[PDB]
Amino acid sequence: SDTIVAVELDTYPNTDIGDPNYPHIGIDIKSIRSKKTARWNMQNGKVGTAHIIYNSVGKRLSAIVSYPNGDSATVSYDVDLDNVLPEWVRVGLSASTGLYKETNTILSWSFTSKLKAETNALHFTLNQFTKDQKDLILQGDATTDSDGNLQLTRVSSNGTPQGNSVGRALFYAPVHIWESSAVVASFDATFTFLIKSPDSDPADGITFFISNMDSTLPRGSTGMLLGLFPDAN
Amino acid sequence: SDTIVAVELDTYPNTDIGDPNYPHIGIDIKSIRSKKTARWNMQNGKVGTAHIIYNSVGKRLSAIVSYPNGDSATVSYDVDLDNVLPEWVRVGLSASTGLYKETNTILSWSFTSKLKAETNALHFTLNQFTKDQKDLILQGDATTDSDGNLQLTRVSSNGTPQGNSVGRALFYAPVHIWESSAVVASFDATFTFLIKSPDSDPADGITFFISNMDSTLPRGSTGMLLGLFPDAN
Amino acid sequence: SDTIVAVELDTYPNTDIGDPNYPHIGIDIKSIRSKKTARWNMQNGKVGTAHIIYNSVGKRLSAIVSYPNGDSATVSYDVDLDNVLPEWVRVGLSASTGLYKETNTILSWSFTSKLKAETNALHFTLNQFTKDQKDLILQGDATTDSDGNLQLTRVSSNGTPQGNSVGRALFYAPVHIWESSAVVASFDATFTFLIKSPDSDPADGITFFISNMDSTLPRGSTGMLLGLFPDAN
Amino acid sequence: SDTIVAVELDTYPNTDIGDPNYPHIGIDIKSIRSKKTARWNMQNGKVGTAHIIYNSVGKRLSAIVSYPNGDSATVSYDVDLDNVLPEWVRVGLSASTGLYKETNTILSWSFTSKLKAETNALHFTLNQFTKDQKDLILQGDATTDSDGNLQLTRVSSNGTPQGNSVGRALFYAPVHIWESSAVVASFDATFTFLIKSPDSDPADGITFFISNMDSTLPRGSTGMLLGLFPDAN
C-alpha cells in the first residue's frame, strides 16, 4: 500500500467514483475520490500550466491550472500533510488513457521544497527532457521524445495518442518533505502540459503526486485511477 | 488614511483594545484589533525569527515566530489580500515602546514577492544594516547602529532601551504585490529580531507590515498602536 | 561625471571611435571604447536574450547574447569591478537611435546581486511592463506601451522606430553592488529584446549598465554613445 | 578511470607531489597536482566557509575559503569544464587523514546548477545531516553524527579524529552539468566545515568535487590523494 497525495487534472468524468460531470481539477489525499474539486475547462491542443502550493503553517494545499488565454480553475483543501506523508518521499507526474485517449505531454516541470538560514532545500527545473534524463525515474509507458518533451502515455510515431496507457515520471532524489526540527515546511510545484485528442471526450488526465520513496505503479490503476491507486476507495 | 496589513509581535497586552492577556502574535487587517491571535512566549534577550507566508490561491495569511530553543507561536487568517491592498505597496518593519520599553532590534530581513515563466518578482535580503542603507526608508526613531543591526526604536549609547519610541523601516522600491494579469500572487517575509528589556513586562512589539506606497507614521500610533494605525478601531 | 560599467549590444559600427566594422557585443568600462568586443549577427525582428555575469572572485565580466535559432555572441573582460564602481549603484537599460533607427524594445529584464548565510541580496524580474511601473525610473524617450513591453526609444503609433532617440530605464532601488565585509560579491543580469528596423543598417544598440545612483542621461550621448557617455574618450 | 574536477582545502603540504610548503587551497583538474594554488591559513577548531563558482561564458573556476574572523584564501583557474566533464555527473565532498589527522566535519552544503526562461536547474541545501540522509551517497568512513553534522572521516566517540581515514558524500541525483543546447551553463557550491586536530600539523584536507556518475573511491587515494585519485600523476 503506497501512500499518495496528488493534484489531479481530471479530463474525463467517472461519475461513479465521485467525479463531477465535467473535466475538473482535484486534490486527492490517499484516495481517488478527491477531497475537493473544481470545474475545469480543458482546452484541446493548448499548453496549460499547473501550479501547486503547500504551506505547513497554513496547512492548505492549493492548486491552480490555466491556459495562455486566461481560463483558470482553482481548488484548495485544508490538510496537514505532515500527518499524511512519510518524512522522505519522491515527487512525480502521472497520466493515463483508457477507452478514451489524449496526449499527456509534459513540456516543463519544476519543484521546490524548503525546510526552515538553517534551511534544508531541494529545487529542480526541467524544461528539456533529453532522451536519457538521468535524474528522472520513468515508469510504465513514459518516454521522452525527439522534441525534448516527456510523453507520460504512449503516442504513436504519427503523434496520435493511444488508449489504455499508463506512465509516471518521478524525480530521482528523494525529498525531505518534512523533518521534525522544522518550523516551516513548504513546497511548490509547476508543470506545463499539452493534452490533445481527436476525441471530443478525451481521457483520463495528468497528476502531480507525492508518494513514499519505493512507490511503483499500482496494478489496476489505469484510466480513472490515474496510475496512483489500486482501487477507487 | 493609510491601508495596512500586518503581522504583529505584540509583547504587551493592551486588553482594552482586544489583546489577549499575554504576549502574542497577531494578524492585523486594517485594524489594530487582530483578526486572529495566538499565545506567544517572548524570550527576553534571545534572537527570534518571524516567518510570514501568503498565497493568493489559498488566500491564507500565515505567520510563525520562534526562538533557537524551539518555542514557536503560529497564527493564520483567511483573507484575500487582493481585496485589501493597492496594486503597488511598500513593505516594512515597525516597532514601538510606550510606558514600558524594550529593544526592537532587527538583525536580518528578507522579502520575496512573485507574480506568475512570465514571472514578475522582487526579492531582497538584508543581513547587515550599514550606516547609510540606501535601500531602506527609515521613519521615526529608526536608525542603524555600529554592529550592523537596525534599531527600530531608540536605544541609548549604553544599549538600554527607551520608552515612547516609534520607528519604521520600509524597503525603498515599491512592490507589485499583485497585478490583474496574475494567476498566482504570493509573498514570504522573514526577519530575525532581538527584544531585550530590564522590564519584567516589556512593550510594545514589532510588526512586519504592508501598506500603500506613500505611508508615513500615523499621528498617535506609539505604544499599543505599533506605529501602524491612528486609532484603535 | 558619471561612472559607468556596461555591456553593449552595438548594432551600428562607428569605426571612428573603435568599433569593429560589424554589429557587435562589447564590454564598456568607463568609456564607449569597449575594452573587448565580439562579432554579433543581429537578427532583424527576432527576440534576442542577453545574459551578463560577474564574479568578484574570478574578476571576469562575461556577456552572451543569443537568438532562438541559436546564433550567439560572447565577450569577456578581466576587470575587478570593486575598483571601478561605488558601493551603491543603480542598474539600468539604455538604447539609442541616430541617423539610422530601430526598435529598442525590452520584453523582460532580470537582475540578481549577492553579497556573501549572511547574504545581502537583491533580485528582480520584470516580464510585463505596466503603464505606471512604479519600480522603474524612465529617462528620455523611454515609455511602456500597450503590449506590456518597454520601449527604450521612441516608436510611432504605427510601430515604426524613430531616429535621434535616447531612453533609459533604471531600477528604483539602489543596489549594494559590493560592501567591504564581503568575501563574495557577484551579480547576473538577463534581458530579452526585440530590435526591428526598416533599415538594412539599423542603429544604434541597447546596453545593460551599472552607474552611480544619481546618474542621468549625459548631454551629447545619443547614437554611437548609447546614452551612457558625454563623449567618445 | 574516473574523471575528476575538484577544489581542495589542502591542510598538509605533500611537497613531493607539487604542494606548496604550507596549507593551501587548490583547483584540481584531473590530477592531484593542482593547476593553481593559494596560501591558506587553516584555523584549528574554527568553522570555515568554502564558496566555489564556475561560469561557462567566462570559463573560469574560482574558489574562496574563509573564516568568521575574515581570513580568506582565493584561487582561480581558466578552464572550460565543458571540455573535461561528462554531460551528467555527481557532485560531492571528500576528505582524508593519513599519518596526521583532523576532523573533517561538514555542517552545511549547498549546490546550484543552471542550464540556460528555458532553464534546466538543480539546487540543494543541507544544513542538518540526519542519520539516514536519503539524498546523500556516503562512501568510505563517512557517517552522520548525533549533532546533525556529516563526518567525512572517522571520529571516535570522544570526538578525537583518527588517521588513515577516507570518506566521501555524493548527492543522490545526477547533475546535468551541461547540455549541448545551452548558451549558459554555470554552477556554485558552498559548504561550511570544522577541521580540528590535536596535531600542530593536521592532515589531509577536504574537497568539493565533480565526477562521472558511477564514481567510487579509487584504491590508494587516502592521505595526500584526498579520496579522488588513484595516483599522483
Ligand SMILES: CO[C@H]1O[C@H](CO)[C@@H](O)[C@H](O)[C@@H]1O
Ligand atoms: C469506460 O471506462 C474506461 O475508460 C475511461 C475513459 O478512458 C476510464 O476513465 C476508465 O477507467 C476505463 O478505462
Ligand SMILES: CO[C@H]1O[C@H](CO)[C@@H](O)[C@H](O)[C@@H]1O
Ligand atoms: C500605559 O500605556 C502606555 O504604555 C503601554 C505599554 O508601554 C502602551 O501599550 C500604551 O500604548 C501606552 O503607551
Ligand SMILES: CO[C@H]1O[C@H](CO)[C@@H](O)[C@H](O)[C@@H]1O
Ligand atoms: C551618422 O552618425 C549618426 O548616426 C549614427 C547611426 O544612427 C550614430 O551612431 C551616430 O552617433 C550619429 O547619430
Ligand SMILES: CO[C@H]1O[C@H](CO)[C@@H](O)[C@H](O)[C@@H]1O
Ligand atoms: C607521511 O605521509 C602520510 O601522511 C600524510 C599526512 O597524513 C599524507 O599526506 C600521506 O598521503 C601519507 O598518508
Ligand SMILES: [Ca+2]
Ligand atoms: Ca476521472
Ligand SMILES: [Ca+2]
Ligand atoms: Ca499590545
Ligand SMILES: [Ca+2]
Ligand atoms: Ca556603435
Ligand SMILES: [Ca+2]
Ligand atoms: Ca596535501
Ligand SMILES: [Mn+2]
Ligand atoms: Mn476526478
Ligand SMILES: [Mn+2]
Ligand atoms: Mn495585540
Ligand SMILES: [Mn+2]
Ligand atoms: Mn561598439
Ligand SMILES: [Mn+2]
Ligand atoms: Mn595540495
